[PDB]
Amino acid sequence: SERIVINVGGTRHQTHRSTLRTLPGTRLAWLAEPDAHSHFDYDPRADEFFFDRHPGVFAHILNYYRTGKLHCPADVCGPLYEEELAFWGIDETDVEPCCWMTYRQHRDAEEALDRRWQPRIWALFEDPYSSRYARYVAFASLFFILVSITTFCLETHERFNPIVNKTYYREAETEAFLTYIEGVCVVWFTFEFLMRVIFCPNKVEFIKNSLNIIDFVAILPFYLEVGLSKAAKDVLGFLRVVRFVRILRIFKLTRHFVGLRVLGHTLRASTNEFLLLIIFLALGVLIFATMIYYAERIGAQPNDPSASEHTHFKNIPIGFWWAVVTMTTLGYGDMYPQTWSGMLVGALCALAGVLTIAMPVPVIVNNFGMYYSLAMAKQKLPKKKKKHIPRPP
Amino acid sequence: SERIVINVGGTRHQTHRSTLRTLPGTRLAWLAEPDAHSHFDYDPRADEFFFDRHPGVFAHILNYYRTGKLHCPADVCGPLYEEELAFWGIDETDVEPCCWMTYRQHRDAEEALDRRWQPRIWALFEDPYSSRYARYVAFASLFFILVSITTFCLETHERFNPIVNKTYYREAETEAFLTYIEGVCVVWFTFEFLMRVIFCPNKVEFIKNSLNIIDFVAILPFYLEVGLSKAAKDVLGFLRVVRFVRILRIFKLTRHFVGLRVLGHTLRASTNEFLLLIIFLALGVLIFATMIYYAERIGAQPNDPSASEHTHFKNIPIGFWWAVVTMTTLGYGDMYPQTWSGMLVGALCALAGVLTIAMPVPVIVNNFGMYYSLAMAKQKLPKKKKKHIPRPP
Amino acid sequence: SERIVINVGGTRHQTHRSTLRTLPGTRLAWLAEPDAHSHFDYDPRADEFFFDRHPGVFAHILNYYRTGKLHCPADVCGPLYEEELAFWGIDETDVEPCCWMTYRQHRDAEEALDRRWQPRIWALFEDPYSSRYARYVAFASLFFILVSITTFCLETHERFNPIVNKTYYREAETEAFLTYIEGVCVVWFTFEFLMRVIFCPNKVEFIKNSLNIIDFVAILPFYLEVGLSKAAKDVLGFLRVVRFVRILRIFKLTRHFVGLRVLGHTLRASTNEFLLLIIFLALGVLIFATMIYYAERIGAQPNDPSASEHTHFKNIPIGFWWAVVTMTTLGYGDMYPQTWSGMLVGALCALAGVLTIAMPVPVIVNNFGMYYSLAMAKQKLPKKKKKHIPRPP
Amino acid sequence: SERIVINVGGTRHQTHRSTLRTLPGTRLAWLAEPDAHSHFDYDPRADEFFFDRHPGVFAHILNYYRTGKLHCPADVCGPLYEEELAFWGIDETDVEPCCWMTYRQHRDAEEALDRRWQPRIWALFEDPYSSRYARYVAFASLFFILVSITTFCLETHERFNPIVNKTYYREAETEAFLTYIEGVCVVWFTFEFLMRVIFCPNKVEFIKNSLNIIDFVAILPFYLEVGLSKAAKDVLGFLRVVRFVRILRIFKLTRHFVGLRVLGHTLRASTNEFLLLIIFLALGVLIFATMIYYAERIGAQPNDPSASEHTHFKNIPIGFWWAVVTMTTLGYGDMYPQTWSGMLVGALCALAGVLTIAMPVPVIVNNFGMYYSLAMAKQKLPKKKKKHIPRPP
Ligand SMILES: [K+]
Ligand SMILES: [K+]
Ligand SMILES: [K+]
Ligand SMILES: [K+]
Ligand SMILES: [Zn+2]
Ligand SMILES: [Zn+2]
Ligand SMILES: [Zn+2]
Ligand SMILES: [Zn+2]
């Protein structure tokens, strides 16, 4: 009467029926009731109920019954404790904030990290290692993306844009070689795009796929040569700006990399820290721009009609630029303080920038480290054969 | 006789009566005395006293009785151990320094993180989400603060300050548009301020509130147009300097952010590390300024009458500026060593600066990380319903 | 029947025969079978099988039998748990990914960190502390390597390369003193190399040794003076480029240092993070170069025939250089944005560079820290005498 | 026979006599012998030996007996485990390298952190808080040290060194005010120094005290005015260089600070990491200086007689300066690559510098963090009254 002995995995836990009776609806509560002999495993020889569970954590569960606050035992992996409290009926959203960030850590990382010829057609878009043709087409598309990017970067150069005379417009024209190489790359990319269009299951998600969007936007300007006078000039002007995306085709290749998927998950999972960093920088930039603009006017020469003639800080927005360059410890040197007051404000800006940049960035860095370790583990670990054949219920 | 068996949560702990008798006044000490059968729960069948507590930590408490030094078991959350030793009577200020910083960690973070129409009137100052009018007034005050700040930053620009001729004073005058927008913003802010003044409970703390102080100081210069000749020029000169605070109205909006409250708590809780960083920087700056000023004179040309003509380091304070810019790895390039001795001193300055900046900043960064994790946890965790109905004493 | 009591190190673990029978082939499975009395140690008095093992981890092993997922107890060193599960028959490649990176940590670090006168001849190449002649030859080779390096660095100077007139070729010739010192150093190094050639066991690995390769490549140019007209000029031109390696002889001395061996192991063990860092930098550099080149053309003056006359960003590759200098927070200041659009892109470049540089570098830094702590431990720990005399099987 | 039951703190540990007999000379070994009933506490009723010790760690000690390798249980503070194994007789220098750096951590930090009127005379050198006169003399010496330093820094300025004509030597002379203030400060410091000389116990250590050395060296130049023609000019020239130490008197005041004592202990305890950092920087600087000097000559114009006319990298030592400025991400911009090859080498230099600077600096930073946390703990913790009255042996 009032003393009940729980036998968990061969370790006898003793407690009063009242302590079990505190938290109702849970399995131990039902144990405390007078109709428990039939309900649960029990032997009249020793008057102990037997549960075939880890005892080392049942200590902590029973502690939640005793004191009233549920904590995570720091000597067991989060998932192990999760499964134990799941069996005992304790709700997992009860743990104290002192032990919540380590408990809900692996599960946060885990959640963040998560007709006959049609297969052979689609095998050109599957993983490279999934076939030999796949690994060849992947190498070829890599070569052609690189050639496109190099053509772009060389097209913007001077050596390949000699000035010429047109009869009466004077301008610089691009070499023919570049246009020919661009045509070749467009032919290859359009062939690939048409072959991919051949098989397009769930065309809504195919259009929602950012990669295919980038491909089509990148292939639009060249194919607009036939389509393209007054509107034609504006559309060409925006067509150069569209061609600006042609470097974005490199993500098609780098998507199969692991570190980049981890980086995408890190970014999408650390929005709060990015917003925090941007707010810190905005406040710092504004405050220090105002401070330096006013400091640099103290020593202004009275003779000059303008308020500031000898200082780079002729207004506050210029202060914004200097404040960013100085807080990130970049320090180009295009504009710097030139008055003792300006120098004081500048030293404060450098130190405050180091601090308010080093506040949230370590949070973000720890997120990436955790996700990368987990992803590399899940990649390295050989595929299991589920050695444990579970017993029937 | 001399062998007493303590039954804690179904685990029998055995020890000599002397070990219990060492630390007097505590509950176990009273257990050791010969008048313990009535005082505590005890059965003559097994000669064991029964305590319904976590046994895994009673091991460590009894260890304090045995050896004489109290430690924190690194496998339980600090608050759990705190509550257990609180029950057993052990003083919490006895733990060894090896295990004090982790024990008193959550409790440090926790402490650092902590007439009919009058409600509807005050509802304009309450949280935005607390109503719909609140969220609208909040959006409107955001718009008007941003307009005030943009007017300020554009007022300091040249494009909006064209030079003019006044008849005989020559100066640049600000555009009328800016003055009109400023008047509009002042009208709105004064309306808000008067409505807030309508209801001001505990007016002493209302005046002590830094936000209301900033509001009044920011609204004083405009309203001084009517009040405002010899004293008037000085008060206008200081009025521009007062208007310098008008950018501080952005804290009124950003106070409801979480990262900023965490930053305020971090700053206020890491004063020692800030003083340490400032002392390190002062010693480094002084020492390296002297060293570089003397190094740069070794190669001074004898012909020149001045001691230093070819060096930027004409004196030591200039050295202060260079030493800050160089120790923070900023490196503007306005002044740099130009003598082999100067270059040696410069390399030492760069390395020593990296080191004495990276000494205390990680301490501060860890503080912010801990406070931010705890605050984000306490924000995310859904409000509890206190499932545990405590038993009557 | 169905209730089996395992006695591990004096702690009785109780469980059903089914739970043991789940995972077959393991020792506990064989325990569950009806032919277990003879097979294992067992007493009919208490009906318990006795195993003389750590019980605190047998809890977790039996937990793997019960639930079906094997975890690492965070309260025991990885090697201890490894040895226990090795005894019990559990495969070590079954642990959950939540507890794999800490389990397989020490073993990863450990694996990464791992005729009469012929002995006296070879004693000149052995460790310096291994003899007295060894420590003397080591000091002497240090002196001579340093003299060679100083001769090199001074040979490239102007003070030692005065212009002269040759009769009709005009050029600058190196001082004779440098050539004499070089000859002396070559004599010493060739004597050392010949003495080492005297004894060369496993000559294949001797040739595979990078140090001996560097020695021979460094000693080739001088000895080619006798060997060395049209081909002679090209071979001299490449001989200067070969002599460029003469600074690599410093690794011969620094190989006996500990931090450098740890750094070599860190590099070779963190290839993935290096590839990740290089990919991040390549994407960032490409993207930001394109963005800044296009941003800086928005404000281009229309009068100029060239597209860009007032900007340092005349093409995209120049953008590559600026993007590296700006993302590493180096910021020389040779080229910087000069247009409001350029300044926006520049601020984004600085922040994104800090982030994508601080992503993988902490992983690499943690690797080096772990390897260095382990190597310093293994160096400090005095050589053991294996106090534990193991019992015969 | 062969089965011995050890009762440690009420938990029965069972093991074979052979396992105890493995490690000889230790207490458990003596337990295993047949003459153990009299030697140790033992009851024939239960055939168990009773030890009044923590059982949770006796598990691990007995594990050392069983397997043969001693590990540290990660759930107990290092000192607790130290004291337990000290009682059991296990040598502490046996623990495995996997668990040595965490075991020997607190003890490393701890070791690193460690006639009638004569008392009133010496009370002027004792701690400021130790009296009222002490706190006053401390404030006064602070004021006078600051005045000396300000006089120094202003003496090197131009405003206070106007050029004058002496009749025939032309030079700039220092203002009289500075000399008068210097005389006053020297009078005060000499009075303090004489009063301290009054009482000088253990005069050998008084002379070995670096602070008194600095005081005497700083006070020597002024007092040499009376002592001080040909030798006089050289001694004055070195006297300015001696006066260079006058800024070192600030350590007299800052010695009572805590962060500085922690920094001194950190430096003295991290010599290996400093040597490692310096070696890394020397190799990096040498290698990259050579690489950039050779890279920048590829694009050298053939017309120029000199090898390099258009590059800042006219020789290799200049490369040393650039390599330091670039590896520390300082980047003054006085010299930077101007050739595509030079730019490649420069990008490599920036990245390699970040890496080989971030390798050992985190080790040093962790040392400082550990020492600072321990020192702040030992400072905060109130002085104990040793509640535990130990029992007589
Ligand atoms: K910089
Ligand atoms: K710069
Ligand atoms: K810089
Ligand atoms: K920097
Ligand atoms: Zn786990
Ligand atoms: Zn907790
Ligand atoms: Zn271990
Ligand atoms: Zn402890």
Author numbering:
A (entry chain D), B (entry chain A), C (entry chain C), D (entry chain B): 7 to 120, 170 to 222, 235 to 295, 300 to 464
What do the study's own words say?
To elucidate the structural determinants underlying the biophysical properties of Kv3 channels, we purified the shorter α-isoform of Kv3.1 from mammalian cells and determined cryo-EM structures under different sample conditions (apo, Zn2+-containing vs. Zn2+-free). We achieved 3D reconstructions between 3.1 and 3.5 Å for the different conditions, which show only minor differences in the overall structure, and no clear densities for additional Zn2+ sites other than the known sites in the T1 domain16 (see Supplementary discussion). In the following structural analysis, we thus focus mostly on observations from the best resolved structure which was obtained in digitonin and in the presence of 400 μM Zn2+ (representative densities for different regions of the channel are shown in Fig. S4). When superposing the TM region of Kv3.1a with the respective region in the structure of the Kv1.2-Kv2.1 chimera, the T1 domain of Kv3.1a is rotated clockwise by ~48° with respect to the T1 domain of Kv1.2-2.1. As a result of these differences, the α6 helix in the context of the full Kv3.1a channel is rotated by an almost 90° angle compared to Kv1.2-2.1, bringing it in much closer proximity to the S4/S5 linker. Consistent with the high activation potential of Kv3.1, the S4 helix of the VSD is in a less activated conformation compared to Kv1.2/Kv2.1 and Kv4.2, with only three (R1–R3) of the four voltage-sensing charges located above the conserved F256 in S2, which is part of the hydrophobic charge transfer centre (CTC) defined in previous Kv channel structures. Despite the less activated S4 position in the VSDs, the lower S6 gate of Kv3.1 is captured in a dilated conformation, exhibiting a pore radius near the PVP region large enough to accommodate a hydrated K+ ion. In addition to the zinc-coordinating interactions of C104/C105 in α6 and H77 in the α4/α5 linker, two acidic residues (E116 and D120) at the C-terminal end of α6 are forming salt bridges to K449 in S6T.
Voltage-gated K+ channels of the Kv3 family represent an important subfamily among the 70 different Kv channel genes in the human genome, with specialized biophysical properties to sustain high-frequency firing of action potentials. The combination of ultra-fast activation and deactivation kinetics and high activation potential of these channels are key for their ability to repolarize the membrane and terminate the action potential. Like other pore-forming subunits of Kv channels, Kv3 members are comprised of an N-terminal cytoplasmic T1 domain, which is involved but not required for Zn2+-mediated tetramerization, followed by the voltage-sensing domain (VSD) with transmembrane helices S1–S4 which is connected via a helical linker (S4/S5L) to the pore forming domain (PD) of the channel. Here, we present cryo-EM structures of the human Kv3.1a channel in an activated state, providing mechanistic insights into the modulation of Kv3 channels by the cytoplasmic T1 domain.
